Design a protein around this ligand. Structure first.
Ligand SMILES: CC(=O)N[C@H]1[C@H]([C@H](O)[C@H](O)CO)O[C@@](O)(C(=O)O)C[C@@H]1O
Length: 363
């Protein structure tokens, strides 16, 4: 596997990299992103977001800082936890959470986190240049239906999707003040104007749900989400673009995640040549438990053959994760090719998994 972001050799002299993201572009360009965790693995620290771009199918890469933090606090200013999407115009949108003080985004404050915002950039030239940062939360002009009891929110970490009519959907995660406690939930946001403005959906049925992605399936939204301390990824389905949700049994509880906290993973849809819609999930098996997050595996479900049990396809990272921060991953599927980026001992690694997709496609 290629070391895409190397803690021991990078142009920022960063000590650590976390939270990878990948988009396979329609023209075969590969675009990735990662947190630049300059001073170490910590979440609550000084972080920018890098991009790495390749025009030779992953052989070589051009590196840039795609988004800088607000530069207010030399210890705690951070933009992090990328969620991306490619719209039907080819626009590439990146949404990140932004803070500049110590303390977990969801649980530190009982009121709206005052240094918290969601920042968005977009590229109309296939990832070469980015807009200025657009602040989606400083006023009420960009995101409709944000709850009054919001402590904070950000993207689901991974990729969004496009519905049939071109509606853009982003997975998201929110922290809500409820009966003198902070509870966190997954949900989605969507845009009907190519990302300029958004509407927030409503929360999923269980708290302790956070990082997630959704796929589209015949107008429905199906979520696979990190469900902390349950031991598995939860799954929900919405038939009204994220306004209501119910448990989606074929995937709910089917990907096990070991003892302890959950972990981010990715969840994408492919259509094989026989017309079947399949779901692919990347996540650590975490057989050793808690933050070890060993064995980042890729799983497959066939939505047109649901009596067939979820199958482990391969394990792209058959190793223990680093307890300081590891386990995260992101798949991207486009034009019968499949790629993954993932955390690997403080680095980000890259693999082309298209040979495994060919095995599934049976051609
Ligand atoms: C904004 C933020 O803190 N993001 C981080 C989340 C949250 O801390 C948890 O989901 C609890 O909220 O989890 C990580 O620490 C993890 O599990 O490896 C990494 C990620 O960057």
């Amino acid at each position: 596997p290629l070391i895409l972001f190397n803690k021991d050799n990078n142009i920022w002299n960063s000590k650590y990299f976390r939270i990878p993201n990948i988009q396979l572009l329609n023209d075969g360009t590969i675009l990735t992103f990662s947190d630049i965790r300059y001073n170490g693995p910590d979440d609550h620290a000084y972080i920018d977001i890098a991009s790495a771009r390749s025009t030779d199918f992953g052989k070589t890469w051009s590196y840039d800082i795609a988004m800088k933090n607000n530069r207010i606090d030399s210890t705690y200013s951070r933009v992090m936890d990328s969620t991306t999407v490619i719209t039907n115009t080819g626009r590439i949108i990146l949404i990140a959470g932004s803070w500049n003080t110590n303390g977990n985004w969801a649980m530190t404050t009982s009121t709206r986190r005052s240094d918290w915002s969601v920042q968005m950039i977009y590229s109309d030239d296939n990832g070469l240049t980015w807009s200025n940062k657009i602040d989606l939360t400083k006023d009420s002009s960009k995101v409709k239906n944000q709850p009054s009891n919001t402590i904070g929110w950000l993207g689901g970490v991974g990729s969004g999707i496009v519905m049939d009519d071109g509606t853009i959907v982003m997975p998201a995660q929110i922290s809500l003040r409820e009966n003198n406690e902070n509870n966190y939930y997954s949900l989605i946001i969507y845009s009907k104007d190519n990302g300029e403005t958004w509407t927030m959906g409503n929360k999923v049925p269980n708290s302790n749900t956070s990082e997630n992605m959704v796929i589209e399936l015949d107008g429905a939204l199906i979520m696979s989400t990190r469900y902390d301390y349950s031991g598995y990824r939860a799954a929900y389905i919405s038939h009204d673009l994220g306004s209501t949700w119910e448990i989606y049994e074929p995937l709910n509880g089917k990907v096990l995640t070991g003892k302890g906290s959950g972990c981010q993973g990715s969840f994408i849809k492919a259509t094989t040549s026989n017309g079947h819609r399949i779901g692919l999930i990347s996540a650590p098996k975490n057989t050793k438990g808690e933050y070890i997050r060993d064995n980042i595996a890729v799983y497959m479900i066939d939505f047109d053959d649901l009596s067939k049990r979820v199958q482990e396809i391969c394990i792209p990272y058959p190793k223990d994760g680093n307890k300081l921060g590891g386990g995260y991953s992101c798949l991207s599927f486009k034009n019968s090719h499949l790629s993954i980026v993932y955390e690997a001992n403080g680095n980000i690694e890259y693999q082309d998994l298209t040979p495994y997709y060919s095995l599934i496609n049976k051609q």
